[PDB]
Subunit: 229 residues, 4 copies
Amino acid sequence: MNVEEMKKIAAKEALKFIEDDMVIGLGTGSTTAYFIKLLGEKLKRGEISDIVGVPTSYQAKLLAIEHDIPIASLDQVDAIDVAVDGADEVDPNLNLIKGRGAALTMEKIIEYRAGTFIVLVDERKLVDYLCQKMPVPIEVIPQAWKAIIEELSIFNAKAELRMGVNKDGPVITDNGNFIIDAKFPRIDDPLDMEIELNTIPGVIENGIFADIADIVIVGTREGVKKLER
Amino acid sequence: MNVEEMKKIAAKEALKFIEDDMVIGLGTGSTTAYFIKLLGEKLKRGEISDIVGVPTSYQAKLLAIEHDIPIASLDQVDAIDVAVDGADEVDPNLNLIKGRGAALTMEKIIEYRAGTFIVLVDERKLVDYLCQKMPVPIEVIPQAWKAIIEELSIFNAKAELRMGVNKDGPVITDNGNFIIDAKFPRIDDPLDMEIELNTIPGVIENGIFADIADIVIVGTREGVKKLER
Amino acid sequence: MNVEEMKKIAAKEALKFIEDDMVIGLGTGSTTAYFIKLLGEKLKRGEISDIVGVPTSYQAKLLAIEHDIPIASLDQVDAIDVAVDGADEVDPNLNLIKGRGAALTMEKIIEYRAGTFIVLVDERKLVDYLCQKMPVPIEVIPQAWKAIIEELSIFNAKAELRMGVNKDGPVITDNGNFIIDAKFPRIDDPLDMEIELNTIPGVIENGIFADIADIVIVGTREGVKKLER
Amino acid sequence: MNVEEMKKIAAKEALKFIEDDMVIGLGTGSTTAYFIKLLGEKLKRGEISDIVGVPTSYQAKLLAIEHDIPIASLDQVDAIDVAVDGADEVDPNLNLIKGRGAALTMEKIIEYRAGTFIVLVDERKLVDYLCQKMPVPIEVIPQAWKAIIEELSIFNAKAELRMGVNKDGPVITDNGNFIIDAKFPRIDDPLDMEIELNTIPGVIENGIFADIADIVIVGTREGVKKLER
Ligand SMILES: O=C(O)[C@H](O)[C@@H](O)COP(=O)(O)O
Ligand SMILES: O=C(O)[C@H](O)[C@@H](O)COP(=O)(O)O
Ligand SMILES: O=C(O)[C@H](O)[C@@H](O)COP(=O)(O)O
Ligand SMILES: O=C(O)[C@H](O)[C@@H](O)COP(=O)(O)O
Ligand SMILES: [Cl-]
Ligand SMILES: [Cl-]
Ligand SMILES: [Cl-]
Ligand SMILES: [Cl-]
Ligand SMILES: [Cl-]
Ligand SMILES: [Cl-]
Ligand SMILES: [Cl-]
Ligand SMILES: [Cl-]
Ligand SMILES: [Cl-]
Ligand code: NA
Ligand code: NA
């Protein structure tokens, strides 16, 4: 029904979870962008009120501003009620890979504190197992990049430094860091792999989001589907 | 000869200016990358020796490491004998536009102190005047991006925030900043424009490199040309 | 009749220039902290409303949040109506030196765009010329620090890299940079110097705020006095 | 023996582990500074040759340069043979607290990869249990700071944002982050807590250095004492 349609419906269904007076974590990427626009429209209409967004990236912040959604940083609010974001993969147990957009650090910081974490994606993102289709982004302190890559050979990860297109050299994240894309053949224990990667000195955050998503809203070629756990 | 062939010939020619015991500023982008690779091969072969490169970007640093060239940061060296780098545009008085690769801040810090600054370009980079074909990249403190865009426009430039391809949101420079591409009409006084642009609070560096290039090595369709101050 | 009383009365006077529907740049340091607390208390009472603060530092932001003043970054607002901040020195022509607090980059970014920049100070700050009592803080790209300190030689400035007390190594600014404090003999033309310092590749911003203050409110032993240009 | 000499002795002893052709992690702080100076002296006199230092901080890098010790970042070298650094506390099982100098991130990045990690302290730094006298420094992504303090206080840690003295606002680390100092009554399980702290989103590194030290060289009233497990 066209990918973009599968994303928008996921995004429309997400609104059902947003109520007045909420603090909302605003995610990064094309699917969530739809949700942000739909949200600002509903605000303007008056059909929702007293919403504050906590953007997970400059992209989110800018879009929120354009659609006149009031925003605040995490340290300005007392709690994140609901957080809405995309994902690069969604496994059966609702473990995710995120980070294509390179905003994984702020995303986890905000989504970790959210009462409910809502994930929006289209059909393509569903996988049988993590790393079936995509690598795991890992944000690293620049000087540790090579060692980390070499250290990931124990897990047979083919890891590569992500490189800029609209700048020369490595992609730099919003926090001044490099981003390694690690294609594992498989990851059998996402939660513990998440922990493992974070215990490596130099690793800032990794794109495995396990034990964190509350609901996954999927946009199918035939309406909408939802995954819960 | 095609373009790449033209870049290569310019890089080869520059080697003639490199001698044993030199501290060499290593520039950013495709044309200079040929130079770094050839410099590395010369060193490996014993054709040159006792050289130290001072990289103008993570790109240059990483390329040097891969090609076994000893490096050092600017504060580690006594001086910079020669700096070799590319350009987006070169006008008849040897004033340049740089910054496509988004590394203008370190490029200028290093090239500003070089005994000789050598520029490597293919024929296309020659312009009748600065801004005939390319915009001036401006590195800005992130939160000043909008104000600066608005201010430049009042000054008759079309400016836009450079956006990431391998990340969502804006391109982030190696120092954690945003970068704006501003197309001015034609700049008749590059040096005063370069100086006064930097006076704007939030403007960290701009891509006008005036009164600093000493030699421009130009790869042409059939051979090599050398322009000089 | 001591310094803190002098600071408070200047802060109290400043509040007089604030009206409903204003975007206010919130300065850095103890004098301005008094202003931020009074602005918050008046907002608590209901005596002014619809104000948004744009913080010049984490310090100002944190205090604003603690005093429940709505805030935003520069890029979220349409303009800055009034900006309030302190200074290390104020000369007769109302040029300043700022940056003891190391927030000079953000301060100048916000203050440059203010409809009215109000400076608050106790009488210790008044000087007969700039650098009579204090040095000029200069924010610099870390790897350029040694070269810049050497190059400052021509000005006969005694310059030192500012060192951490609650960290080892150099003070790091909010943007990840170093500060060199430079005590010049006496600055003839603050404006020219302000410009000349910034023209040095690697110098990001300097503490000379010339031709930008509109009003200086001064707490003295005799009570409050106001200076305008 | 006065304080320093305890330090000087330990450093003197440490040099005995250093051999020709080694890559050496250069730690942060007053104790290790004596080591870097002695090493510089030994290299100047030809007693050791062909060494490369990998600094853990700007303080270490700048002290190394002053003493003509060649240096490199981690990604420039194939391995770290020995890393030498100080500590705020040492427990009986040779687990440490570090981070008073705010350089814990690069410290752990380098020392984790060292063939042998040697720790230098005087008598005072020994403790019966971790946190008997020092807080655990935790480096955090700035917007997560308040949430992290709240989350930590749910575990009996008294935790405070470390504040600048030579800047206003929070201390900023070399990587542009904040530091939170957390005092638990005690840490019976150092390694477990070290891991747990790092799994919190927004925590980048913590000052617990468990099961990584290979040798602790203690300057002792007596004279000296090399501890190992
Ligand atoms: O993690 C991210 O960067 C994004 O949310 C990514 O997972 C999905 O972005 P998309 O909606 O454009 O596919
Ligand atoms: O300034 C830069 O970023 C580069 O040197 C650019 O000007 C040239 O890149 P190129 O050699 O790949 O065309
Ligand atoms: O420039 C700064 O950092 C401050 O505004 C400073 O100059 C004034 O601080 P104070 O009001 O505590 O003296
Ligand atoms: O961890 C650090 O930052 C330092 O090693 C420090 O904690 C020990 O410093 P000292 O040798 O000056 O006491
Ligand atoms: Cl992302
Ligand atoms: Cl780069
Ligand atoms: Cl560039
Ligand atoms: Cl890109
Ligand atoms: Cl972004
Ligand atoms: Cl300041
Ligand atoms: Cl400090
Ligand atoms: Cl440091
Ligand atoms: Cl601050
Ligand atoms: Na950073
Ligand atoms: Na920066």
